[PDB]
Structure 1
Amino acid sequence: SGQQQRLLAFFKCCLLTDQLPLAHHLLVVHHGQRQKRKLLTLDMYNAVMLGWARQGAFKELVYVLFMVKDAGLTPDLLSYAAALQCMGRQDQDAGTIERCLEQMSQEGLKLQALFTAVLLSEEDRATVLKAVHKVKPTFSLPPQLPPPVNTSKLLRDVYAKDGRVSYPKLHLPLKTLQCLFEKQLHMELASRVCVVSVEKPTLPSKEVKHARKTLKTLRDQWEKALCRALRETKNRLEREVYEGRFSLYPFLCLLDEREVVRMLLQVLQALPAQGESFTTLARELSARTFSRHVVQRQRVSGQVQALQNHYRKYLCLLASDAEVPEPCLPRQYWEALGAPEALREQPWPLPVQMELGKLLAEMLVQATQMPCSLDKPHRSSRLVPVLYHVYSFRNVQQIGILKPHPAYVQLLEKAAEPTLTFEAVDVPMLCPPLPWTSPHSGAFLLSPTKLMRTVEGATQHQELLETCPPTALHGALDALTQLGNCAWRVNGRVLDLVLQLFQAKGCPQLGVPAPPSEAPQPPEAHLPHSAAPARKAELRRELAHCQKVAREMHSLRAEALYRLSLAQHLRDRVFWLPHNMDFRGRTYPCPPHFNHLGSDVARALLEFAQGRPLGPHGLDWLKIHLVNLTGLKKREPLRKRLAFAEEVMDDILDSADQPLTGRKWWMGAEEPWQTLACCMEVANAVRASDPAAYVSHLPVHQDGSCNGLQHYAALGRDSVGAASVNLEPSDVPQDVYSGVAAQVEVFRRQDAQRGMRVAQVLEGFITRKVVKQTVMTVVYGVTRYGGRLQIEKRLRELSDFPQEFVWEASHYLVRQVFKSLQEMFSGTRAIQHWLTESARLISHMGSVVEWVTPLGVPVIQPYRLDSRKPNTRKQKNGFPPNFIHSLDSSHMMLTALHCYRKGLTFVSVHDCYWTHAADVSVMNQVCREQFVRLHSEPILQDLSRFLVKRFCSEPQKILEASQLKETLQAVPKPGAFDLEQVKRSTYFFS
């Protein structure tokens, strides 16, 4: 019932905001009426009972107990826990505590049921225990001191006590890290951070400062008016409740009035000039109010000080000058010492959320006024509202939006604010992140956090990760903690050049956008009389294109400005990137704007804060990484790459010394900015006195060719297939992209032997680049539609004839990849067909496909039709790519966990492993070892057994279950390829 949910939310917010007599009066009014005593459940009664219990108030709690007795309900363990907690606060006679313990022992309730089944705070548990110790001083709880340890086959050596322990440590002392924690706490207590922009500053003239002054006085008047309106609304809502009616007064009293008016002013500042829909604004205001309440409760509850103390104790493990009695993983150290853990947030009902948002929006619209005329003449003293309701058209619907006054928009445009705004969760952390200990506790301080980013579902994903035993997630959580404990810093030398090109006519070929002043102007203007029938009609065609180009340029410059502003904020600071995962298991950083899963500019601006000496082989790996980023030699062995690096050393030194003045050899590569960064690093390393004693901060990358086909070739143990994906050792690396390109080219020549024009047009216009993305994403589940879109996008950047609808190139790519399957990758075709058929037959029986990774992470597919039926099309076309993604995520997590034990700094881009230049060989050995160890287990047999146990278990529909069992017990036979040879392959990851 909606009214019951509203009343329960009212009472919970009352006990959150200490407005207990108000809730008591409303409860009494509802209990008195015979028609209102119904739809009242025990949750409201014992919520008010616990609120009375928290601060003395024995008489009121006894009266609430009397109401519960008169209502005809039966009290539960939570009510008795509340009763025992009040008695503790103020010491009371022994007989009363007992005259209650015996009553709880009667009627079936247990003495220890409240301690385990009922979730209460530490203070409440301590008060209840002190209330029981008055009667029974010998009562005690089991300690359960030893934590559980994962004992799976793949994760056995990670958690083994015996062995060599070489866990890495940070380069910063304890006091500096404590100051960084304080800075992060002060930043995150506010919900918003202001950053100086990178756009070239304009000198403030007279009218600019006049606009700024009138903005200041308008904002002061708006703040006063909003405060008065909030006070009047609060008084009206309190008077409404005193008449025994539900209102939003406790929800409006969640925060201080200053915080609410600041939030309203900030959302007024960010409101678009054209406008935004009223419902979206209401939802945003309600969500911001809830988040701010969650953050600012922890100041007055006292959790901030406890978190500070436990953080200061925990950072002795990561400090350079501090030591621990026994080295251990960060999550295990945080699990000890009695550190607190975040509790799951209880979301509000949707109706009260929407009503609070609409109330705040109406307050903002009514309370804000401005003078009608911006001019100095103040005739007639006319005051008009700033925001109006406009019933406009959005999508193919009619929506009521909120629109500002054009005078306000002109005033905001005239006074150019040089400050951008960001959310505290959208910026990198200024202190080391919290260890991941649960799906709902980790990463950011003092803020709700979700382990999984899946917006769709989110109630079945979070149910499978909280039902499984806690050990099964451990190898994931540590892998998410290890990726979070990587200290980052900003390379300022690259940043100077990037901002130099940004604050000028930009260079779009290097990846920096251009200002709107260089938008393509129309060739000419219109005329009154058209000279030709073709005239006066193509002007719109060649002008709307220019407008679209200008809009795209504006969007690109906006995103570049945001990224560079956030990068310039963190120029002289060390920051950390907390990580989450999706439902498949793929890992992503939490800050979206500035991270290493980005373009060339974003990756070149990021460096390791901690550095290591190059050693005997660091410089060679740096040069091989530079050649790899250059892209000139991808089909050559490593020794020829090193020789090429030796040959072009003059260009490297010239690019490092003169990036934008002399020769520009770094321009002309696939990643010019990372190439320039590597050139500077190599130039510094060579010119040092000892090239092996040079400390390098530059990450070196090792990548697989096609990590989807690399897994398909190994689940089927396919012999000739594994040769093409470098699973078999060879002196020369094998490129699958060039072989597909060659096959499509020769069959295009064969088709052009016959009479076709599209084949003859595509003579010499097909290369590795046009097919690389498509071939890479075939194993990821692309269709011919998406493949054609990708090929059209790639062919719209050449000198191709205007026949850009190439439906033949995608057909040839799919067809001759399938022919390559028929020749050498037959296991891939067999396994993909088997997986698709199994997913289809599971979907037809009204079920969603669920499985478990070999690391123990449960995965469920959330695609459902608009309880609801599964979407069979999305359910059966996504199972093999999701399985491959789970497998490669498991491989990456295993590699990270086994590289941490050897003192390596490991960070992961999908399929790409980045580490220090002195640790490349160790990481390669660990990667090959974990790939052989992952595939030495019967993955397909275990999957079939799980799908025969989970699905195909009910005998109600025997006819479908029979075919399900025969298809599920039809695993393809493996080939004759030997897996151990992967340990001796040099180009498996390169």
Structure 2
Amino acid sequence: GQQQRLLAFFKCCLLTDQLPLAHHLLVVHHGQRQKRKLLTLDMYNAVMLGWARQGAFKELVYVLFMVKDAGLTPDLLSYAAALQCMGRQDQDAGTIERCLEQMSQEGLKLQALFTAVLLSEEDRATVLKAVHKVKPTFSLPPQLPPPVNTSKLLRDVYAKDGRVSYPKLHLPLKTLQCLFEKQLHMELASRVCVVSVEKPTLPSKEVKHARKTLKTLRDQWEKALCRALRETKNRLEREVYEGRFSLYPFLCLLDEREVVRMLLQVLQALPAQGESFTTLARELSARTFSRHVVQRQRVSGQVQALQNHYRKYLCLLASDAEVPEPCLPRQYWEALGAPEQPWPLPVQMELGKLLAEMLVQATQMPLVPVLYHVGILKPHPAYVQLLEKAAEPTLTFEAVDVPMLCPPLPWTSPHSGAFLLSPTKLMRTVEGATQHQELLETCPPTALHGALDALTQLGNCAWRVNGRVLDLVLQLFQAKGCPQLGVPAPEMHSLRAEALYRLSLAQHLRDRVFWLPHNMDFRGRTYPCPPHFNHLGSDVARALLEFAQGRPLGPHGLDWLKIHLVNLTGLKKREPLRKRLAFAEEVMDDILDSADQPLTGRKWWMGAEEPWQTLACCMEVANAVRASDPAAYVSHLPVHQDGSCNGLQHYAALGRDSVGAASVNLEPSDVPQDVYSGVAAQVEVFRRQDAQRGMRVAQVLEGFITRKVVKQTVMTVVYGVTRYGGRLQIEKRLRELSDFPQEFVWEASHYLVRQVFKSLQEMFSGTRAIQHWLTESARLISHMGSVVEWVTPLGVPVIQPYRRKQKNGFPPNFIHSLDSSHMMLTALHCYRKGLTFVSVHDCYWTHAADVSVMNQVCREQFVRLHSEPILQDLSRFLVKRFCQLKETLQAVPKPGAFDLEQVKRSTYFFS
């Protein structure tokens, strides 16, 4: 522990340029006997590297002498620091050769230094300059070409033979550079102030007095915190000079201004009900570390190098700019060259405790303290009352939460990508994050390249808020709200608070396009990085966003737009595309009326399943048909396509079950079939039978079973393992339209889930067999004291963070990974073909013009994925990994009789 603290102290001294203090502390440690043993060659080499970077040959020799006196041998790091100092000071070739001869006598090699010692570009250049003075013919081995994956699936994707026509952003190179500069400035600021979208009364009797007194209190708090920080820093300086270890360099690492500003921001964002003391200390320490990381990237020239590289990388995305050879964003970034350590837990904890105690001490108000000990730091009732009376309209958000205004950095590695100056991991999950990351690092780099390119593609998409829909939603939200349409009205209080955050951000991004960086989960489902964009399934959010880039509708663009409007309305679900288009043409008068006068009129859209999306589609088709040439009209609206229960689709594809394929519409058919309606009829029959037998739940739950509840139950059974969209949402859907007593809603939901599960088991034989096999395999692997692990068809390793839950989650997780691989393949092929494709909550969004091409690519990639021996490869991997278990793994479910190629002909596969 103490050795770790000392190592962290020396590393922080190196980062802060406090080599005098580091040297003093090391000399004290060496002079004191019992403390000499606590030192380590790592700390010696850290101090040596610091003195070398600063150019102190005398001090470097002194540290080497101390090392030799401590019975320690010089290592590659010490020799690297020595050579760096020699090259920096232009030392003599004689001394250089003597040092190299000593190093060779010690048994170390010169070529192994550049490979085993971690050094920056400047240090490497200085060491090479020093070496060349004695060995001018010493050149490091030339870098090899980057490796490209050649998987049976990604072969056509990464093949140079296949022709490509990737898309190009509409913004010009200069505007892209300007937006990059804006994003860089905002991320350096680290905080953004947005105007609230709540009607301001602006009174003077109470609000102005509250605001003025709060300003006075803020000034007092700031000028007290400054004094407290200065006193603490002086105390720590004296403590270190005395000999004992402290957090002086850690405090000096961040500017006093930044420290006090972050403290005040945390105090302002403190919840009224209160927050835990340990949580506050952890937050303070993590914030200090992150701000230190960003300011270090700034001062160390890393920001300048990133800007220099980005100005060139934007040539690929910019339309006017043309690169020599077309290639993926990650490939271009790696070709141009990508520029290149968490603190100890106890150090972070002590720093957080110190900062929190300093805050609690310097916080005084008319003088009584502000934070009290209830370890729960609850604010002052008077303070929260004053803040409420003030009601500052501005709201503060983190630079990472706000969507980026420039193309996200391509995902070059699990760590490098997405945000600019902020480190972003590939997997969002914090449970087992260490396991996920170590597995992703262990598996071959070429394996993850597919997923990284897929994420880069999904991220490199421009978005903008729809002005009309945003204005309408704001008018409804401010005018007492409209729960019917989904707009909250002033539980509900939390929903209103959240909606205020999202709508406020929407107003901020009214006239500026943004980009959404995407990360993954342990299952493989992609999710936007910003936490405010989590609620993407809402019709409000779905109608607000639109692709900033718009393409010509083309010949079938208007037909596809009308079909999408009909699907959103949901009035004609069983009808085919021709009859849907006929109905769209029939309700053309109401569509135009809705597009012209939404608020005042027939409100036809209001009588739709998704009112906001229906209204947006009405506006779009109106603007399209009102122009001279409807095909010439440019569309910016995302058209969504989904497969009825992708989980059951994948199950049927794996089982080759003809009945299941016909039910989930895998086989060609002129009319679409609703597996939801089939399961609804089955569960209704089961309810009737159980009611005749004598079950009160079945007797009372008569007729209320509807397509919506059946869809939710199927999603929970096929895609649900206590996750978002499960039994809780089933209960919510039931209550929302519940005319029966709510006392047994929980039991009714349980019974419905059970009956739907049994009905699915009875109907889908292949699904039943595959689910039973996976369940038994997971159960046995858990009984053997191991966690279930596998590899997706693409190559991404997947592990379960749960530490039976594994038994119940293995089949859903496998199906999720299959769907994610299918989506990644479809997205990669669309990007190769020059299409704008995104995945938003199991619904593929594209443009109205390229819907046919997207569906074709989806069918082709689905057949390609399910043509490989997925189950056989899974069984072989499981056996090789965990080796009665082997017997069950070998007993792969028998495949049925079904020509999977027929999927290519199915026109209702995705609708």
Could you tell me the TM-score, scaled by structure 1's length? 0.89
The answer as to whether partners of 1:669 and 1:675 remain within 8 angstroms in 2 is yes
CA–CA separation in structure 2 for the residues paired with 1:846 and 1:631:
49
| SS of residue matched to 1:851 | strand
Distance in 2 (CA, whole Å) between partners of 1:88 and 1:424 is 41
Contact 1:595/1:602 (8 A) holds in 2: no
Rounded Cα–Cα distance in structure 2 between residues aligned with 1:37 and 1:24? 14
Q: How does 1:899-978 map to 2 (within 5 A)?
A: 899-952=830-883, 963-978=884-899
Q: CA deviation at 1:505?
A: 1.1
Match of 2:609 among 659, 666, 670: 670
Deviates further, 187-196 or 67-76 = 67-76
- Looking at structure 2, the residues matched to 268 and 211 of structure 1 have their Cα atoms a distance apart, in angstroms, of 17
- Measured against aligned partners, the alpha-carbon deviations of 1:451-499 in whole angstroms (never above 9, x if no partner) come to 1111011111111111122111111111111111101111101111111
CA distance in 2, matches of 1:480, 1:146: 23
Is residue 793 of structure 1 aligned with residue 732 of structure 2?
yes
CA displacement, residues 488-545 of structure 1 (integer Å, 9 cap, x when unaligned): 1111011111111111211011111xxxxxxxxxxxxxxxxxxxxxxxxxxxxxxxxx
Partner secondary structure for residue 849 of structure 2: helix
Q: Which moved more, 1:345-354 or 1:814-823?
A: 814-823
Cα contact 1:285–1:360 (8 A) shared by 2:
yes
Deviation at 1:551, TM superposition (A): 10
Q: What is the CA distance between 1:823 and its match in structure 2?
A: 5.2
**Length, aligned pairs only:** 908
Query: Does structure 2 conserve the Cα–Cα contact (< 8 Å) formed by 1:595 and 1:603?
Result: no
| Shift of residue 810, structure 1, vs aligned partner | 5.5
CA contact (8 A) 2:173 2:319 kept: yes
Whether the 8 Å contact between 1:567 and 1:594 is mirrored in structure 2 is: no
Q: CA deviation at 1:860?
A: 1.2
Instruction: Please give the alpha-carbon distance, in whole angstroms, between the structure 2 residues aligned to 1:456 and 1:807.
Output: 29
The 1-side partners of 2:226 and 2:738 are apart by 64
C-alpha distance in 2, partners of 1:879/1:790?
21
Q: Which moved more, 1:203-212 or 1:773-782?
A: 203-212
Aligned counterpart, 1:474: 449
Deviation at 1:275, TM superposition (A): 2.4
* In structure 1, C-alpha distance between the alignment counterparts of 2:206 and 2:889, rounded to whole Å: 76
Provide the rounded CA distance (Å) in 2 between the counterparts of 1:88 and 1:321.
45
Asked if structure 2 preserves the Cα contact closer than 8 Å seen for 1:775 and 1:813, the reply is: no
Deviations 1:787-834 (A, max 9, x none): 765554333233533264267755765565566556542121111111
Tell me, yes or no, if the aligned pair for 1:932 and 1:979 is still in contact at 8 Å. yes
Shift of 1:784: 14
Shift of 1:176: 0.9
How far off is 1:164 after superposition? 2.3
1:74-93 alignment runs, 5 A limit: 74-93=73-92
Contact 1:283 1:354 in 2 (8 A): yes
CA distance in 2, matches of 1:791, 1:418: 37
SS at match of 1:402: strand
Greater helix fraction, Structure 1 or Structure 2: 2
Once the two structures are TM-superposed, the CA of residue 612 in structure 1 deviates from its matched residue by 0.6
Q: 1:808 to 1:498 in 2, by over 3 A?
A: closer
Alignment partner of 1:387 is 2:371: yes
Gapped regions of structure 1 (runs ≥ 5): 372-383, 390-398, 513-549, 864-872, 953-962
- The answer for the alignment partner of 2:706 in structure 1 is 767
Determine helix, strand or coil for the equivalent of 2:839: strand
> Is the CA contact 1:596–1:909 (under 8 Å) kept in the aligned structure 2?
no
1:267-325 per-residue CA deviation (whole Å, 9 max, x = no partner) reads 12122333222111111111110010000112210111111111111111111211111
User: Alpha carbons of 1:435 and 1:625: their partners in 2 closer, same or farther (altered >3 Å)?
Assistant: same
The aligned runs of 1:12-161 (5 Å cut-off) are: 12-161=11-160
Decide whether aligned partners of structure 1 residues 718 and 83 sit closer, same or farther in structure 2, where only a CA change above 3 A counts: same
Q: Structure 1 residues 734, 370: CA separation in 2 closer, same or farther (over 3 Å shift)?
A: same
Quick check: 1:503 aligned with 2:442? no
Distance in 1, Cα, partners of 2:696 & 2:422: 61
Contact 1:30 1:36 in 2 (8 A): yes
1:747/1:271 CA distance change after superposition, 3 Å: closer
Post-superposition offset of 1:404: 3.2
Instruction: Quote how far apart the aligned CAs of 1:107 are.
Output: 3.1
CA contact (8 A) 1:490 1:571 kept: yes
Q: Distance in 2 between matches of 1:814 and 1:568?
A: 41
In the TM superposition, residue 102 of structure 1 has moved relative to its aligned partner by 1.7
- How far 1:755 moved relative to its partner? 4.8
Q: CA deviation at 1:754?
A: 4.5
Q: CA deviation at 1:783?
A: 7.6
Q: Which runs of 5+ in 2 are unaligned?
A: none
Alpha-carbon distance in 1 for matches of 2:376, 2:269: 15
**Change in 2 beyond 3 A, CA 1:730/1:281:** same
Q: CA offset at residue 386 of structure 1?
A: 2.8
Q: Retained in 2: the 8 A contact 1:172–1:319?
A: yes
CA contact (8 A) 1:596 1:603 kept: no
Helix, strand or coil for the counterpart of 1:460?
Answer: helix
Q: Is the CA contact (8 Å cut-off) linking 2:591 and 2:604 kept in structure 1?
A: yes
Q: Which string of whole-angstrom CA distances, capped at 9 and with x for unpartnered residues, describes residues 144-176 of structure 1?
A: 242111111000111111232211111111111
Please give the secondary structure, in 1, of the residue aligned with 2:171. coil
- Matches of 1:596 and 1:576 in 2, distance apart? 17
What SS does the corresponding residue of 2:410 show, helix, strand or coil? Answer: strand
Partner of residue 359 from structure 1, selected from 354, 365, 368: 354
Q: CA RMSD in A?
A: 2.0
- Give the secondary structure class of the aligned counterpart of 1:730: coil
Residue 726 of structure 2: SS of its match in structure 1?
helix
Could you tell which deviates more after superposition, 162-171 or 498-507?
162-171
Cα deviation, 1:186-237, whole Å, max 9, x if unaligned, reads: 1110111110111101224154333323322332232222212211111111
Q: Give 1:597 deviation, angstroms.
A: 2.5
| CA apart distance, 1:617 | 0.2
Per the alignment, in what secondary structure is the counterpart of residue 793 of structure 2?
coil
Separation in structure 1 between the aligned mates of residue 66 and residue 845 of structure 2, nearest angstrom: 65
- Percentage of pairs with the same residue: 100
> Does residue 898 of structure 1 match 2:897?
no
CA distance in 2, matches of 1:360, 1:966: 59
Determine helix, strand or coil for the equivalent of 1:806.
Answer: helix
The offset of 1:842, in angstroms, is 1.5
CA contact (8 A) 2:648 2:664 kept: yes
Relative to 1, partners in 2 of residues 1:228 and 1:786: Cα closer, same or farther, differing over 3 Å?
A: closer
Aligned with 1:443: secondary structure?
Answer: coil
2:805 to 874, 886, 902: 874
Give CA-to-partner distance per residue, 1:106-151, whole Å, 9 cap, x none. 3332111111122211111111111110111111122224211111
Q: CA, structure 1 residues 222+243, in 2 after alignment: closer, same or farther (shift >3 Å)? A: same
Change (3 A) 1:161 1:784: closer
Query: Residue 716 of structure 2 contacts residue 725 of structure 2 at CA under 8 Å; is this kept in 1?
Result: no
Change (3 A) 1:177 1:13: same
The one-character-per-residue Cα deviations of 1:615-648 (angstroms, maximum 9, x if unpaired) are 1000000001001111111111111111111111
After superposition, the Cα gap between the structure-2 partners of 1:206 and 1:895, relative to the gap in structure 1 and judged at 3 Å, is: same
Contact in 2 for aligned 1:439/1:450 (Cα 8 Å): yes
Residues 404 and 798 from structure 1, CA distance in 2 versus in 1: closer, same or farther, beyond 3 angstroms? closer
CA contact 2:697–2:751 (8 Å) conserved in 1: no
CA pair 133-755 structure 1, distance change in 2 beyond 3 A = closer
Does structure 2 retain, via aligned residues, the 8 Å contact 1:596–1:606? no
Specify the SS of the correspondent of 1:913.
strand
Choose 764-773 or 329-338, whichever is displaced more: 764-773
With over 3 angstroms needed to count, the CA separation of the structure-2 counterparts of 1:715 and 1:789, relative to structure 1, is same
Separation (CA, whole Å) in 2 of partners of 1:401 and 1:762 = 46
Note the alpha carbon deviations across 1:857-897, whole angstroms, 9 max, x for none: 0111122xxxxxxxxx2222211111111111000000000
Contact 1:586–1:885 (8 Å) recurs in 2: yes
C-alpha distance in 1 between matches for 2:659 and 2:522: 33
Matches of 1:122 and 1:622, distance apart in 2: 54
Give the Å deviation of 1:761: 2.4
What's the secondary structure of 2:375's corresponding residue?
A: strand
Kindly state the Cα deviation for residue 965 of structure 1 after the two structures are TM-superposed.
1.5
Provide the C-alpha distance between the structure 1 equivalents of 2:384 and 2:747, rounded to a whole number of angstroms: 51
Secondary structure of residue in 2 paired with 1:205: coil
From the superposition, tell whether residues 283 and 823 of structure 1 become closer, same or farther in structure 2 (CA, over 3 Å): closer
Match of 1:411 among 382, 386, 392: 386
Q: Is the 8 A contact 1:771 1:791 kept in 2?
A: no
**Aligned twin of 2:588:** 649
What is the CA-CA distance between 1:27 and the residue it aligns to?
0.9
Task: Give the conservation status (yes or no) of the 8 Å contact 1:792–1:804.
Answer: no
